[PDB]
Amino acid sequence: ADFKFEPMRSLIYVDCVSEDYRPKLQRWIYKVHIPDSISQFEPYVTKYAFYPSFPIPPQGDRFGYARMQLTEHHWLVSDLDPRLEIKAIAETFPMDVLVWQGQIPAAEGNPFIFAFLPMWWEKDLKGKGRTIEDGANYRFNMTIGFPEGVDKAEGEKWLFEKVVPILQAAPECTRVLASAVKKDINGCVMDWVLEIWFENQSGWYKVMVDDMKALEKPSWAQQDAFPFLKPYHNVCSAAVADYTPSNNLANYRGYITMR
Amino acid sequence: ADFKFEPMRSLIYVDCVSEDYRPKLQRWIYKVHIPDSISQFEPYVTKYAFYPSFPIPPQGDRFGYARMQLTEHHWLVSDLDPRLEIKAIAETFPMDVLVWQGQIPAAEGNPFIFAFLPMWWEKDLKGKGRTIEDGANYRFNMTIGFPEGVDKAEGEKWLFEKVVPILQAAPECTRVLASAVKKDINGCVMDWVLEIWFENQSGWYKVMVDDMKALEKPSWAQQDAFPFLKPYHNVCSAAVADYTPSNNLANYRGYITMR
Amino acid sequence: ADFKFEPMRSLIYVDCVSEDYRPKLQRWIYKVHIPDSISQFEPYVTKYAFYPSFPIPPQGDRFGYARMQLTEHHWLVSDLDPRLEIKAIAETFPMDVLVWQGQIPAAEGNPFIFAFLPMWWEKDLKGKGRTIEDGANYRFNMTIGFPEGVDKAEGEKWLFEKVVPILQAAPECTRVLASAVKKDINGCVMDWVLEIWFENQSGWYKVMVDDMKALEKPSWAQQDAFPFLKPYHNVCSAAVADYTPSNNLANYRGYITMR
Amino acid sequence: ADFKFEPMRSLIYVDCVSEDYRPKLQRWIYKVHIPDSISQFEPYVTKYAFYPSFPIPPQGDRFGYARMQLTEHHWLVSDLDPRLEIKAIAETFPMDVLVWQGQIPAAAHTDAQIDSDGDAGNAARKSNNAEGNPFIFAFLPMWWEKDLKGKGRTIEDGANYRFNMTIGFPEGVDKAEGEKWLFEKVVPILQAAPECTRVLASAVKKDINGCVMDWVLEIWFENQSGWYKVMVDDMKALEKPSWAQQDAFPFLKPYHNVCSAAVADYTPSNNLANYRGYITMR
Amino acid sequence: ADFKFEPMRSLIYVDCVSEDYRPKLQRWIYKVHIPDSISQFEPYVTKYAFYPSFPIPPQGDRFGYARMQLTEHHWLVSDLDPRLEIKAIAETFPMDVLVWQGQIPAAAHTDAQIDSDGDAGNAARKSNNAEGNPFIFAFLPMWWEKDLKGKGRTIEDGANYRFNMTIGFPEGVDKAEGEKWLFEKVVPILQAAPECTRVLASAVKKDINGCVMDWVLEIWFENQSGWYKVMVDDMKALEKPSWAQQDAFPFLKPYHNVCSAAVADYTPSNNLANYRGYITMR
Amino acid sequence: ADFKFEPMRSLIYVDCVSEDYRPKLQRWIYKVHIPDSISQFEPYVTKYAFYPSFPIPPQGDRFGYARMQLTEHHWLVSDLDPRLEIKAIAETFPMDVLVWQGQIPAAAHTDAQIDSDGDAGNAARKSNNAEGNPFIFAFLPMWWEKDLKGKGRTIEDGANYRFNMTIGFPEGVDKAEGEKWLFEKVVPILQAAPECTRVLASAVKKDINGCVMDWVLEIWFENQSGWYKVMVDDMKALEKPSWAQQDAFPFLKPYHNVCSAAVADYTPSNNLANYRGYITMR
Ligand SMILES: O=C(/C=C/c1ccc(O)cc1)c1c(O)cc(O)cc1O
Ligand SMILES: O=C1C[C@@H](c2ccc(O)cc2)Oc2cc(O)cc(O)c21
Ligand SMILES: O=C1C[C@@H](c2ccc(O)cc2)Oc2cc(O)cc(O)c21
Ligand SMILES: O=C1C[C@@H](c2ccc(O)cc2)Oc2cc(O)cc(O)c21
Ligand SMILES: O=C1C[C@@H](c2ccc(O)cc2)Oc2cc(O)cc(O)c21
Ligand SMILES: O=C1C[C@@H](c2ccc(O)cc2)Oc2cc(O)cc(O)c21
Ligand SMILES: O=C1C[C@@H](c2ccc(O)cc2)Oc2cc(O)cc(O)c21
Ligand SMILES: [Cl-]
Ligand SMILES: [Cl-]
Ligand SMILES: [Cl-]
Ligand SMILES: [Cl-]
Ligand SMILES: [Cl-]
Ligand SMILES: [Cl-]
Ligand SMILES: [Cl-]
Ligand SMILES: [Cl-]
Ligand SMILES: [Cl-]
Ligand SMILES: [Cl-]
Ligand SMILES: [Cl-]
Ligand SMILES: [Cl-]
Ligand SMILES: [Cl-]
Ligand SMILES: [Cl-]
Ligand SMILES: [Cl-]
Ligand SMILES: [Cl-]
Ligand SMILES: [Cl-]
């Protein structure tokens, strides 16, 4: 039967719940998981990259901050088509990975957030026309999912009519982009992915912590302050640079170790 | 004037009928054929690779064993769409290649077997969940086409009800995958491609030669023992390693000669 | 919210209107524009290449000869879909580029010609079967657009019944290929792209200047001799080699400067 | 005249003194500096790589911890030969980089290209402003000189938290007596600790560029907790030397007489093989 | 404490003694060993490549035919300098690899890491076990010393069947006498045969690592039949030397005093340039 | 015997004497010659690159302007050591290449491989036919010896029109006298011109291969108009030397005692890193 052309970009928010786990998790990612993953999807994924997170900022924990990385894929077909379940070689995936990332507690576990999007941002709300010449960006990529039972249209209205205007009013914020999550692909609980750029951490803080104190607490709030959503369950995020050396289809040459 | 998205994996079974032809055939493949091919299909083939065959095992001749390599393409469009017949630069093809591969005797000819498949295996019959951590595989890839006149459903039933249970019972066999050949693309006479993994040549032989002696000779048989098909005409195969260095779109740097 | 699978090859005719602009234009292209472009379209462009123009041949100015290069993209999706207008990082594009290329004058400016085509030539009009072994080609790529008010079918008929037979008849011409421009993509004013191969510049001249003197001047002619179309507005062209080192998705490593 | 074959490995300890500087410094390193550097030395440097530092561990500030990265080169000739001062294209090197790294304090007009009589990049790499931290650039032989613990360890043995530390004894301290202290008092503590899986050391080639450091050591643990147990708690058993410039081990002035970084076994920034220009996220 | 500039080409003759071992040995080589090796010597080896052996020709066993590959390095310094024994990460080298290649007989617990006083990889590469075949690692200059037939041959002249053979004369045989036999009796048979298109030779650098071999020759043919016609049938003309260890040419004990491989002009496994990790078939 | 460590940069001035030859010469260089060359010297050449020439400026013919490219190598050992004459595979090198480049006049049977008693490529590269132009292959140190103008210029300062010129004084002229004219009369005119942003020079290493040239200079401008203003108009102030072989600067015989090219700062043809075979346009 036919396979549908379905160009998409996806983001996975990869936490590391203890610094003691960092060397093991990073080793699995770069030594074991890159080659397994390239082996599977090289013919139908056009780009596969990791964007290591900047140091977690003050209060970043309340935003479900991914302390390892954002993992990004660009797909030509849906990876959730049931025909793609079959693989000659399955990935080497120890249970420990789920512990390191926080899906399994070693107090409450966190879901694994794997959000599919169109390849192009749907909404350009601030900073259209910004070029790389204009300077280094502190790119705060945030996904949110309204609580079960909350009308999606109500939440959309809050996000674009109450939240985004505070971003627009802050000169510290240089860029605001958004897309709806493709819920039809894999059941992801998130509803929106936004990327919100600052010059630096102080600017992120000024706007996302201090300026947002102006917002009323919504009746569905899951925490007392913005983003008003349960960390790691209904909000995940990461702050990343413009560039990553881990453009894995182009740049990987095996696990070469330091002398 | 639309072009259909038609993601496919194809396999060509490349023999070398005499050791005296090996240097010439290998030279044409790596020095001439790679650059011509990449020149033509770089924009719509996402992977192009050669898997050199392991040394022919005992009785491998009876299985249409490809003594040079399996050639693998992953396509985004059908190469058989008539619009793709037009090429700025046509491939440099000495017709001696056909002598070297055995399509032309220098003895009747053997056909050129080029089988199109979906990119993902259709049936996972044994070893689901095996990872590269489980060990090196001796991967026996075999394509079969039932003789003219044999009902294809009764061939399918023999294959899955008599042959595959013998693989399932053998501990030497670690993996069985299969896909129906896309006969609609190019007229290929083959009906199935299977891949059957062992630890080694001895395991391959214990199962595919000794255990298969329990099978009854079908009425349509073209040889006396399994696979009961005419070698190189109705069955072709190769045993290959998990890995090849000949991943041509990523790894080719021109024909560099030994000093 | 589906994206259509629309594989296409596009060509941009990049002039350099004074030699004093060459170092600046070339620097912008290779230092600034390559990384901007790759950043944008890596997940949906399978090939991106520059073919530097051979030295402008005698009377080449009358063919809208692009004195810098042909820029070539192979797309999987239409870049003119309005959803693709949104980009996180906009290309660094100084106004000076348009002066250097000749869109912005100083006497008259020239349009920016960006012609979309199918990935495979539609008409193979001479030289089918030619291989790279047959020798080095002087590849003259020319796009034409009939003037405003001229009936397109009447231009087509002139092109294929009067112009092409002269090319076909000349032993100096080794290859003729043509496609209709996909005018529905971006409104490009051109109607056809042809590629016409010679051994060298002398052969080009013999045919495209001397043999073409046999044509009657059409009633819509915008200049006295073939191509009878206004240079850079209704005709653009470049002569290029079979090979380019600038296959940018595979070969670019940053702007490494000479020692 | 001839050029001497002089194979060496060098290490530069790159700090980032405020998180607000991080995006700017990182951009300069990866977008501007890599291409300038590769352009200059491609013909005589066989490896050029960056090892980004793990998050600064508790009390890492006392060890001159580099909050950005370790920069590593493998040379075939000495970069400090005076004939190598001449370069067709000099590095684009604003004074801001020294501010971001902590070599100099923040100031007006630091977007300006560095000024020196000779090469800007070479001069920046000798920075020693009394109000900042010196620029530490240590040359070594390509092979570790002393293997003091964990010989035979393979990559199959597991992920390492590799703590690379360089030390330089203070002005007036006899080098031979610092050496003896290092190898007879310090190193036995590392050997005794089950948490330390490797100890390697080389003498700094001071003759190359006047680097004030004397030794580079690399000391491996499983993780930050192991590093802390050994390098902070276990070292409390040491007597404070008469020359100490701080109260606890390393007893040396942070960022002036000791620099360090903890890094992973692998880096994706193997720049002569892996760099493809400054591709930006979509 | 200087390191000498010592440009060299080395060849290792890699056998596979049973077809059942091939998938395991090939996996170790390509999945495990490449990255360990590149990690160790990237800064001072300018090329590292594998040339898989063509199928063993008839009577190839008598020439110590390597059934897996030739491994080739181009070195800038001697790997045998004792300072190069020290390695941050040692090679993952199970004893099994020695069984698969035929250095040692099969035995219990050969999945263990090689046990050595010094570096395991270096020890492995000196394997010289009485019940197996020695590990043959021959160092050469980068340029062939003697060009004896086919000077001026280009790649346009056609595909070569390149037979690379190393020989070492037995215990007690004068080296000058063996040299004289090689060049005055053996080589003129190659020169007369039109099936032989190329003859090249170099003296083994015996001083680097104690290699028992004395010469490396490379001898080209069009194909296996040409090889056999010359190296088997034409060589029957030679008289059997008094030192002979087998009845026919090469008159040397297979795998101990002669190793060989027939290889193609090109390899995809130019590892410093072409390796991208162990990507597995779908 | 040992090989001397001899790091050098070499330049070859590649002309194309007729536009009709351009497709053929260009094909040979990129399709045939790159792989033959990389095959030979990958282990001891650290960089191999082609810089295509900008279009020949007005009066460029009087400067021996290379209408194809500059070919650049960075060597670790001398290519002219006699031991390097031996090569397993010689370059595919038809006489026609010498026609295309202007080393020899056009003639029958020039598709023939070059015939030499030693290596054909090395012999091609010593071409010096009385009816053509010699083959100019100049060896230099890897670092410019003299920095005479524009020290400290970065790539941020803008695009360069880089005019690389080599000169050799005629038979009989005292080399010290030529040197003094170059540096006391010619260079000051470059230093004085505001259009000139950079002047670098090195002495040709004449001991390597007997190159006739004595100096290589690189002289930068903004563009072709700047080049002409300085190198044609400003140079009219110079007195004609008594050894002049043409009436105006450079006063040397085009293509025999002066060769040159104007090139950009960047080339895509960094051949050891960037070459992936001869992929043809669709
Ligand atoms: O033309 C090819 C094969 C044709 C064929 C020849 C003989 C048969 O009995 C069946 C098919 C062909 C090939 O064998 C190899 C290749 O790489 C490209 C080809 O077109
Ligand atoms: O890179 C990915 C992809 C993902 C995945 C698995 C299977 C599949 O079919 C598609 C994607 O699994 C992961 C699990 C992780 O913990 C961390 C990651 O970075 C990833
Ligand atoms: O991998 C998961 C998903 C996770 C989960 C989901 C949703 C949610 O709201 C909280 C946790 O629960 C778990 C609990 C476990 O013991 C082990 C697990 O592997 C998991
Ligand atoms: O970019 C353009 C296009 C150009 C033009 C378009 C179409 C055509 O037929 C002729 C010229 O006119 C211009 C005139 C300007 O002052 C500045 C410009 O940027 C331009
Ligand atoms: O990456 C390098 C290269 C280094 C260097 C360049 C040229 C040279 O000759 C010697 C060293 O300078 C630097 C200075 C830094 O602050 C940070 C860095 O990462 C680097
Ligand atoms: O590929 C190599 C590299 C070689 C080697 C590594 C490091 C070193 O220092 C010297 C040699 O060891 C080997 C040993 C083998 O059995 C087979 C091999 O292919 C190789
Ligand atoms: O590209 C080169 C390499 C050069 C060369 C090869 C081998 C060697 O030993 C020395 C030099 O020969 C050439 C000769 C040319 O006409 C044009 C060229 O571009 C070149
Ligand atoms: Cl923690
Ligand atoms: Cl900035
Ligand atoms: Cl709260
Ligand atoms: Cl195994
Ligand atoms: Cl039978
Ligand atoms: Cl002009
Ligand atoms: Cl030709
Ligand atoms: Cl006119
Ligand atoms: Cl681990
Ligand atoms: Cl002292
Ligand atoms: Cl203190
Ligand atoms: Cl051949
Ligand atoms: Cl015998
Ligand atoms: Cl001409
Ligand atoms: Cl002729
Ligand atoms: Cl500029
Ligand atoms: Cl004159």
XYZ file of C-alpha atoms in Angstrom, chain B residues 9 11 19-24 26-27 30-31 34 47 51 54-55 70 72 74 119-121 132-139 141 177 195 197 199-203 240-247 250-259, chain E residues 9 19-24 26-27 30-31 34 47 51 54-55 70 72 74 142-144 154-162 164 200 218 220 222-226 263-270 273-282:
116
model
C 14.486 -0.236 -1.120
C 18.429 -5.083 -4.090
C 37.830 -15.264 -10.238
C 39.676 -14.066 -13.294
C 36.977 -11.450 -13.843
C 36.964 -10.150 -10.240
C 39.550 -7.369 -10.647
C 37.869 -6.002 -13.767
C 35.348 -4.609 -9.114
C 37.205 -1.834 -10.921
C 34.129 1.285 -7.838
C 36.001 3.418 -10.435
C 29.723 4.736 -8.510
C 21.170 5.787 0.285
C 27.529 -5.210 0.686
C 31.133 -13.428 2.231
C 33.002 -16.367 0.623
C 24.423 -7.069 -3.029
C 21.228 -1.599 -2.404
C 16.808 3.580 -1.331
C 11.745 0.306 2.808
C 10.579 -1.679 5.824
C 10.369 -5.479 6.140
C 23.661 -5.175 17.493
C 24.767 -5.900 21.100
C 23.613 -9.563 20.638
C 26.563 -10.254 18.312
C 27.864 -10.469 14.746
C 25.414 -11.832 12.224
C 25.901 -14.003 9.168
C 23.074 -12.471 7.167
C 19.660 -12.673 2.053
C 12.463 -11.371 7.912
C 16.752 -12.508 5.183
C 20.511 -14.862 10.069
C 26.076 -17.086 13.689
C 28.220 -18.425 10.923
C 28.660 -20.440 7.832
C 28.378 -23.758 9.754
C 25.043 -22.707 11.185
C 26.796 -10.489 4.180
C 28.072 -8.726 7.281
C 26.108 -6.236 9.410
C 28.345 -3.416 8.225
C 29.802 -2.202 4.914
C 32.369 0.527 4.345
C 30.738 1.086 0.963
C 28.012 3.512 1.891
C 28.535 9.376 2.358
C 31.866 7.628 2.077
C 33.195 7.759 -1.546
C 36.167 10.081 -2.195
C 37.142 8.984 -5.700
C 39.250 6.091 -6.907
C 42.346 6.398 -4.682
C 44.946 3.751 -5.566
C 47.285 1.827 -3.220
C 50.871 2.968 -3.067
C 54.757 2.584 5.840
C 35.174 -19.231 8.006
C 33.215 -19.535 11.183
C 35.410 -16.867 12.772
C 34.992 -14.310 9.909
C 31.882 -12.524 11.130
C 33.382 -12.101 14.667
C 35.354 -8.628 10.948
C 33.064 -7.146 13.541
C 35.328 -2.535 12.030
C 33.231 -1.875 15.102
C 39.080 1.261 14.165
C 46.918 7.271 6.608
C 42.805 -3.808 1.905
C 40.866 -11.413 -2.668
C 39.727 -15.114 -2.298
C 46.334 -6.255 4.827
C 48.429 -0.411 6.340
C 51.710 5.546 7.388
C 57.123 5.102 2.502
C 58.640 4.655 -0.995
C 59.521 1.363 -2.613
C 49.440 4.005 -14.900
C 45.962 3.270 -13.529
C 44.699 3.680 -17.099
C 46.651 0.495 -18.004
C 43.998 -1.622 -16.220
C 42.983 -3.436 -13.065
C 45.750 -5.089 -11.116
C 45.802 -8.277 -9.084
C 48.368 -7.118 -6.615
C 51.982 -8.447 -1.749
C 58.458 -3.721 -6.522
C 54.685 -6.564 -4.494
C 51.253 -7.659 -10.048
C 46.090 -9.489 -14.392
C 44.207 -12.137 -12.430
C 44.455 -15.232 -10.283
C 45.317 -17.471 -13.237
C 48.292 -15.300 -14.106
C 44.479 -7.139 -3.201
C 42.738 -4.684 -5.492
C 44.078 -1.225 -6.457
C 41.346 0.529 -4.386
C 39.885 0.066 -0.886
C 36.775 1.743 0.500
C 38.384 1.424 3.929
C 40.618 4.511 4.046
C 38.966 9.827 5.791
C 36.010 7.441 5.242
C 34.851 5.989 8.624
C 31.484 7.104 10.024
C 30.795 4.592 12.751
C 29.422 1.102 12.646
C 26.254 1.698 10.617
C 24.265 -1.578 10.275
C 22.288 -2.963 7.346
C 18.516 -2.531 7.491
